[PDB]
Design a protein around this ligand. Sequence first.
Ligand SMILES: *C(=O)C[C@@H]1O[C@@H](C)[C@@H](O)[C@@H](O)[C@@H]1O
Ligand SMILES: [Ca+2]
Ligand SMILES: [Ca+2]
Ligand SMILES: [Ca+2]
Ligand SMILES: [Ca+2]
Ligand SMILES: [Ca+2]
Ligand SMILES: [Ca+2]
Ligand SMILES: [Ca+2]
Ligand SMILES: [Ca+2]
Lengths: 114, 114, 114, 114
Amino acid sequence: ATQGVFTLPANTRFGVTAFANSSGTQTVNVLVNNETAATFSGQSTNNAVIGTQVLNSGSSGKVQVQVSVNGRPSDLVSAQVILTNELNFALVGSEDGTDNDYNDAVVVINWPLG
Amino acid sequence: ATQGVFTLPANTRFGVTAFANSSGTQTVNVLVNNETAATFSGQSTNNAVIGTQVLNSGSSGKVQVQVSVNGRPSDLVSAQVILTNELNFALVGSEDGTDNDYNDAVVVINWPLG
Amino acid sequence: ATQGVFTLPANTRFGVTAFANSSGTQTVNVLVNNETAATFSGQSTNNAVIGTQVLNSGSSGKVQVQVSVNGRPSDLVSAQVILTNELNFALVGSEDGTDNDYNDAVVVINWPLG
Amino acid sequence: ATQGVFTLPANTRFGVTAFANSSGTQTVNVLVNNETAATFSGQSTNNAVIGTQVLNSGSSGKVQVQVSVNGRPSDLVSAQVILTNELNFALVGSEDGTDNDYNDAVVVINWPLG
Ligand SMILES: *C(=O)C[C@@H]1O[C@@H](C)[C@@H](O)[C@@H](O)[C@@H]1O
Ligand SMILES: [Ca+2]
Ligand SMILES: [Ca+2]
Ligand SMILES: [Ca+2]
Ligand SMILES: [Ca+2]
Ligand SMILES: [Ca+2]
Ligand SMILES: [Ca+2]
Ligand SMILES: [Ca+2]
Ligand SMILES: [Ca+2]
């Protein structure tokens, strides 16, 4: 199944943060309405924040996270969870190798902000 | 119900990161097996990272997040989500006022690391 | 009588540790030379350590502990005890309510260290 | 004279917390009714908390603290202090070598909890 795609409310600001747990350098692309809005690169085996920014969901509200390492797409896992019917997390894990810890790049989207 | 308390696998490194979205200065305390292990503080109304750090879950794996603003505890919502039986997120939202957006301090715990 | 004030030997490392046994969120201020040197906050009814720190007694050796819950100073009990003319504990109890168990925040200062 | 043994009220929750101040790894065993109830181990020269736990008095209320380093028992000092006839500290210092600072393992027992 498709992973890493989330439909946010239209024209809503959200935060996106990325963490790295791999010897390989993680590049994370966040696409808004099928166009790229932010790009994080970094290497870390200790969960360092390689990127975090605020973006707007736009007309569409379509948000997609992709994870490449050295030009190889990583296998993604994802889900959205909503607490008290109002606080939202869109969650992405990814695997770049064979150990299946799916933490090599971890991406957290949260809204609303402010 | 108790919120913000999570049982992790024993002696496991985990990441904890807090973002803020409130006029009020947020204070996040992270206790591991009933000893405070990390303390974040900051103020932001557009999701700034006010703290991030790697901790070990220790013998019993008990992690608790608490959020206060000027000595008053905020009301917490929480849940844990597990993807592909391997990647864990423990999620905390908090409300320090009356608007109930529960994003005033947002805390994300993730594991495994490395 | 004043409680929670102790005169340490000047320029001496000491440990300070706070426990909580209250439904109320405890805020422990530790002042050295009448300036706040450390602040702990936390909530527990099972004696969690809500803060621990190593500090220096400074020029004056004067250390003071203050406890409030939601801005209300608690009533303090204190004493100092010295074992084999060497081992020092400065002890603080505090009550934030009416049951007078004086365990709501418990603060223990010990020296020498090392 | 015997040190590190205290008669608590029967069937009473109490906290026990240990600090290390030595190059040697300290092992702290807490016996309730002559039976091992908790074991802490660790090494620090900066008063790090090597263990905290809540235990029960039991029928006897007999609590005893023992400290060993590399197998060899440390010499203990102890006293109990009661403030406002209600808040109890049972206090232990230990010496594992020659300098007689008696802080090599420091254990604080306090009650009541809650
Ligand atoms: C409640 O506000 C008062 C408070 O919490 C109780 C659980 C108990 O610990 C009591 O001693 C404390 O004052
Ligand atoms: Ca991997
Ligand atoms: Ca990894
Ligand atoms: Ca709010
Ligand atoms: Ca808010
Ligand atoms: Ca009380
Ligand atoms: Ca109490
Ligand atoms: Ca010694
Ligand atoms: Ca020592």
